[PDB]
Symmetry: D2
Subunit: 475 residues, 4 copies
């Protein structure tokens, strides 16, 4: 059942002398092994990418788009095969895992068509000074070079493809470093690009141990761009190693849901629960604190409680709403946040149970700012409700977070909601709906500790391109 996997290096599939065995978090089942690359093997990956860059960047846009469409078609063909393993590898619900692969194909196809019709511009010297009226600048787009793409355990295929396809269509070459927990899924994605015929070296994979290659892959001079999704502390560390090279960071969140007195409380509760407890709360973009006006807090809390009690809690193969968390340390961290809130007097509206690393969904009311749960990102199924007296207080508490990814506002007064949104230190505000990354053409960005750079398809392509200006005088 369990298979030995290999890295894609310069069109070939390569083992290493050592490997890493990967086990299913929900069951402990052995899923397979991936190579534990050395620094010398990382050198070979990067050497082949740089050699392939010249012939890749001089292909036409339409030729590069064709490879991407073919790889998307293969992902769709094999989505049940790949999704089944992804489900086991990161304890994601089976149907949700298959949906991840299908969404990745949609992003790949969309990026191919977005990127191929990008344009340059022509600028007039006479816009700025009369003496230069016959001088014009022809400005065309060019790739940045080699892109290091680092995907996360919670979206090991979706947030690999969100990086690979925008980079490739622009004419960049790519090396994908998946997280160890999620490396099998990353290599299954690689297989699709290889079968699609991506030229040798244009796309490669790297797997290995942090203690062996963790810093080495980022500090290497061959890398021209670093594109990372993961934890905030790891993201900060990457910034210290970037030097002059551009970087994109998609890190943590503590998204607020602001609920005003005129809100539809039943609809707010439905959206809040869907957003907060998806994939057991192991998502950066997700409602992680409710800031609710006193007058409606009792009723909102009862509506939320009713739905939380109905969530299914169990195994990935059963498509449970709440599945086991990624590992024991992660579950320990969440249990600690829950104990701090209990010990400081918060009202537990649903009960805490832990079976292995399967934590039941916990809803707290009367949370206050002295509780860790008011501020820290749990990455687990626990939601605090914080009561406020004015909208001004909700804005202040919201913005006091070190995080600034997204926010939700629930109200029937949209002109007022827009005014609140202007004051919120976040990337995106959703009105009468949960926070979410989609649709993937929309911008996706975070402020403060939540990241750097703007993604969403067209924004990610622009981030991973530069310009080349040719200037001449008309006669």
């Amino acid at each position: 059942l369990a298979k030995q996997y290999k890295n894609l290096v310069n069109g070939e599939w390569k083992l290493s002398e050592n490997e890493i065995t990967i086990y299913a978090p929900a069951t402990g089942e052995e899923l397979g092994s991936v190579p534990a690359m050395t620094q010398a093997e990382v050198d070979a990956v990067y050497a082949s990418a740089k050699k392939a860059l010249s012939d890749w960047r001089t292909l036409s846009y339409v030729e590069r788009a064709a490879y991407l469409h073919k790889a998307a078609d293969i992902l769709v063909r094999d989505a049940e095969k790949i999704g089944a393993i992804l489900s086991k590898e990161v304890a994601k619900g089976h149907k949700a895992a298959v949906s991840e692969v299908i969404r990745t194909a949609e992003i790949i196809n969309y990026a191919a068509e977005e990127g191929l019709r990008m344009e340059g511009e022509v600028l007039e010297g006479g816009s700025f000074e009369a003496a230069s009226k016959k001088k014009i600048a022809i400005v065309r787009r060019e790739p940045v070079g080699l892109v290091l793409a680092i995907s996360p355990f919670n979206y090991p295929v979706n947030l690999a493809g969100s990086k690979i396809a925008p980079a490739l269509i622009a004419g960049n070459v790519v090396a994908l470093k998946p997280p160890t927990q999620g490396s099998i899924s990353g290599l299954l994605l690689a297989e699709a690009f290889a079968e699609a015929g991506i030229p040798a070296g244009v796309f490669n994979t790297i797997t290995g141990r942090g203690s062996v290659i963790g810093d080495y892959i980022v500090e290497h001079e061959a890398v021209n761009f670093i594109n990372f999704t993961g934890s905030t502390p790891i993201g900060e560390g990457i910034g210290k190693l970037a030097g002059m090279r551009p970087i994109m960071l998609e890190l943590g969140g503590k998204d607020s849901a602001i609920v005003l007195e005129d809100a539809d409380l039943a609809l707010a509760a439905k959206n809040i629960v869907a957003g907060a407890f998806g994939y057991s709360g192991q998502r950066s973009t997700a409602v992680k604190r409710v800031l609710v006006m006193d007058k409606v807090a009792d009723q909102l809390a009862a509506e939320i409680k009713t739905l939380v009690e109905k969530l299914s809690v169990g195994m990935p193969e059963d498509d449970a709403d709440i599945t086991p968390l990624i590992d024991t340390s992660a579950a320990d961290f969440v249990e600690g946040l829950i104990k701090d809130a209990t010990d400081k007097g918060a009202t537990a509206l649903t009960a805490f149970n832990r079976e292995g690393n399967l934590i039941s969904p916990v809803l707290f009311d009367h949370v206050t700012t002295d509780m860790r749960l008011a501020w820290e990102e749990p990455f687990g199924p626990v939601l605090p409700i914080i009561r406020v007296t004015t909208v001004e207080e909700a804005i202040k508490i919201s913005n006091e977070s070190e995080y600034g990814l997204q926010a939700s506002i629930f109200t029937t007064n949209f002109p007022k909601a827009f005014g609140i949104a202007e004051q919120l230190e976040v990337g995106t505000v959703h009105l009468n709906n949960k926070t979410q990354r989609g649709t993937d053409n929309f911008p996706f960005l975070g402020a403060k500790k939540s990241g750097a750079g703007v993604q969403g398809v067209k924004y990610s392509i622009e981030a991973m391109t530069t310009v080349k200006s040719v200037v001449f005088d008309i006669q």
Copy 2:
């Protein structure tokens, strides 16, 4: 003078307990002093700016633009007065220094009108998935926050204003840190903005000693964006301190002038000498090596020699072509490159002479790429001619540089020149003209060790803004 200059801090002018005396590099004349700020005084600058940000970013674009236009009008009025002091401070020709101030006013006016008409976008959910066809995203621009602007000694007013005005029109607040040599000119620029009535704390200045505040100003958590122009080693140091903050870097160059067999050799010589020896070669964008096809090399070299022999060598007040270099270490470094070239057998077509830090312009022919002068950026008045026998060889030698700012191609075959330009690892290619940053609406950027980010006016405004997306569902 005994003229004690002062920093602009929250609408007030402040001395510090200690000061730094500034002397003219060409003559030793005492020009005055600037404050030697403490770390706590930097704290106050940044606290003032973050306080001012809330009310500044909520003004209308038209209101912000009005302040910039008024500041530009004052700079034009005081161009002779300011340029007279700038000339002394950095040993730039008097007329050239006045021209710098006039050009700064042009950039400020253009940035105000470019920024105030920036637009947002509305994106359709149904471009990506049918189920989201009623979901739209209203995407509007917002400032990034506090911009740290660091100006260079060779354009202490032009490449201060190039940062300040684009930052301010977008709703950012700014702190300007000038180099010590160039701090008087920076504070003179600040006077114009204060007299225009810029609100207290929206624009401030910092001056002091690197050993006291150098890293502190960059690492401070109040700073949200770093915009730097200066030397490559200093720029690399700033990259190591940026962390997650976006940065722009404008560093050194070693621009090649590629001269083909069909070129207008007299025109090539005129452009080459103008670009290479302006401000004594102390410019990042400047022809720094001639790569010439051997069949026309003898004729080109004689044309260049004739012009170099005629360049005037002397004092800034007399508008000499070649003025004294910025300090003794700079001249020593240039002397060492010349000595290496001479010792390795290059042909000195004009004679090296040095009086104080005034080096006469040196033209070398038959330079080979084992010579330091073929690669290292002198920031002084010395130019090598390197002979090649194919355009492919010229392209390889050009791209072998660690620098990638601009290049010139001299030829009558423009379709061929466009094909060469595609292969050159640079930001901008000029056909039958010297390299140059203008016109200032055109993009200005460098590849490799030449920097990061895209300037030119509209590009610099884009770089110092982010977006805020508000998403809702139509019913």
Copy 3:
């Protein structure tokens, strides 16, 4: 009272015949304007086409500088120009001065918008691999000579809204003001002349429609017609246009849809301000209220009270309601009012006419059988039409041959957006009156309300074309 002259090739020209202009509110003689012959029109157009080559070869910054100087002069002389504008078209004095100030704002904005226009570079490899080395360099060019035709109700604002966008792009311009409104147009032209505009780059034409009306439009020197005025006149220009591009800003019958959850005091304030500005002589203006039954009685009472507060009198006293532009216009409005009365509409405010000064008339219980439900009055009369469902409101709104703008008053903004998608109009204002501003926003109408998109950047693009230069990289 002065004898006015046309600007022609940098000089001020009299004609053999002239037309005396009188103030509509008083009968005061204001002056005369030339009555140009067809041969004089030929001379204007000849000067323009001769001036075009040098004008289009100037840099953008050079053309922008002329526009900024003209705007500065208009600001300087706003009181002087506004005082005569107010008399010429019976517009309140202060509103007339504000028109001139707004026109300067538009001229300056068009100068700076137009000078940073950019082109595109397109890649053959976006479409086919074999063409990857072929690129298209696409740059904007002027269209040529623009004929700008201004309206009586904004004789300076909606002259400058055409002239400045045209000029920054490198077009040359001939302005034909309406006879009633020609003095104000010629006062605007004085500022462009004093600003130093090269001879022939900007010219004016005045005269009688029966002599030069059709002639000026079908003349083949004209490459673009940009017209604001009545729907029937506009429709006549579309046929004489041939293949030449045209922009039309014609009539409106803007609906104000008021739902059950609306702030009725806010709706009433905006409806009255929009409907009765300049005595209702505006294409963009609330011209029919479509209100849900449940809130109709309360809304009507509130609107009535605000209508009764409007002042009714002379332009020099800054009256809200001033005399209409001419007797025929007042006669037409009186006939619409009488039709509504004879068909059973409730006159919430009463009809009173002194000369051509009509008091503001508010009707309730207006039905689709009445002319006032549909025809544009260009006078101070407003109907209220009760509806039973939002669907009925949308149907009645779209049944109009006009489709300029609409207002929606409601606290449910997602629902308001869904309604706006269904309304056959250019612009929908949420919880506000309809309006053209701000002038950077698009301004357009559907159906009989016109053609083309204005607002500053849109107008500049409309009066430019593109030139593509294609070559293969080697």
Copy 4:
């Protein structure tokens, strides 16, 4: 014998009477198409306007999916369709199949271009401080019912170039092919039908010009007219359009300017390929060589050699030069040749005519008194006109009433760019023949050559309008 039918409201429909179509090169009977009455046109338009509401409220994703499906089907059937197209308009068999393949490329590209078009959010504070809380949300909308009128010389390519851009934006479409070319248009329609296009969203009309010609255009259901064809027919559509927006792709007389430093072998190759493609029956095609005296003798000789190698024969044999579309077309070309000869032009290749198959004629020493210097032949005849200066070449080029494209052959690119600025044309090609492609590039013509800008993204923009929703942030 095959009785073709129109696509109307999702059904295939005959009419009472039909029109028999014959192959121009051979006389073969190809089938019949319906001769619709005016009442039948009413029914087509009624079905389309009924379908519009449900079609424009689909997602972009869903409309794009139908277009991709139709393109896939055209590729599948490209041989079958191309074989009939070849016979219907006497186009080389291989060239006809290639037309179908290119049409699928355009349909796919339009689907993906149109689905990611965006709107704008404008700030009131850009224009005035007091409006800084007011924003405009500006989204694109379809114009409604688009009438597409395709030409005989590209009866599939320049049908789909209209249909696909219109449909992705949310318009409904009626296609009126020309009678000669109607079978090919109906074969294209089959692919859209099999793709599942909803009933009434896409429809076809066939009939005689005398019965329905003006009727289909004047009909008030039509909101947009997108026409390709002869200049005299296009000028007639401009009148009937009223206020409605139109696009016209009409005739051309493209100049090839050859300077003293040109690569004459390259110039001759491109000139002959462009001038004689499809026997010269193309609006975009070199139709006059303007060559500097000192290289004219050698250029003419190198052009002559290439013309003499062109094959002259039948469409099914992929001949370079095929019989012209009908007898009147050939008669008109013969008259131009006779006029040039009688006025002293030199026949470097000789006139011969068999039926409507005219051998390719190259004339040197053509002067401006000859009709062939100016009139569009739509046949295989090319004049060479000698000039003494580049200034003279520019003047003669711009004296034409046509202004579609131009070629400049020279090794001095900066000078060629400056010349291109002075040429009154849409597109200038450097060191290459004139051409419409690649299809993402703009395609437009000045003066009598048409109105509007096509190429894929430009054609989507042309067939949309905007809807602005404005509100105040609190």
